[PDB]
Amino acid sequence: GPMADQLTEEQIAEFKEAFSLFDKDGDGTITTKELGTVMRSLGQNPTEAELQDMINEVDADGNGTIDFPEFLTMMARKMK
């Protein structure tokens, strides 16, 4: 599970911008509610459990939400 070998600063800025679209209130975390809001804009209707599954696979410290370090770590990983 390494992050992508070539991770540019501009890709990191895009990760911050993407994070800010989920964390709209700017408290530095993404909740299941904030994730559901964005995915309902996408045309998906996930359940409260499906949302918790997607949070859980990004949530490295198990505190129930996603912070930017967790988001960035997962994003640069999927960047491969």
Partner 1 sequence: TTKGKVMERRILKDFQIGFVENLKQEMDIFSSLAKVIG
Footprint of a copy of itself on this chain (CB under 8 A)? 3-4, 20-21, 24-26, 37, 41, 53, 56-62, 70, 73, 76-77
Asked if 40 and 48 count as a contact pair (C-beta separation under 8 A), the reply is: no
Residue 76: name the closest of 28, 17, 30, 8 by CA: 8
> DSSP string of 11-57?
HHHHHHHHHHHH-TT-SSEE-HHHHHHHHHHTT----HHHHHHHHHH
Q: Which residues bind partner 1 (CB under 8 A)?
A: 11, 14-15, 17-18, 21-22, 35, 38-39, 41-44, 46, 50, 53-54, 57-58, 74-75, 78-79
Question: Minimum Å distance from CB 75 to partner 1?
Answer: 6
Is 34 annotated to bind a ligand? Reply is yes
Question: Minimum Å distance from CB 64 to Ca ion?
Answer: 7
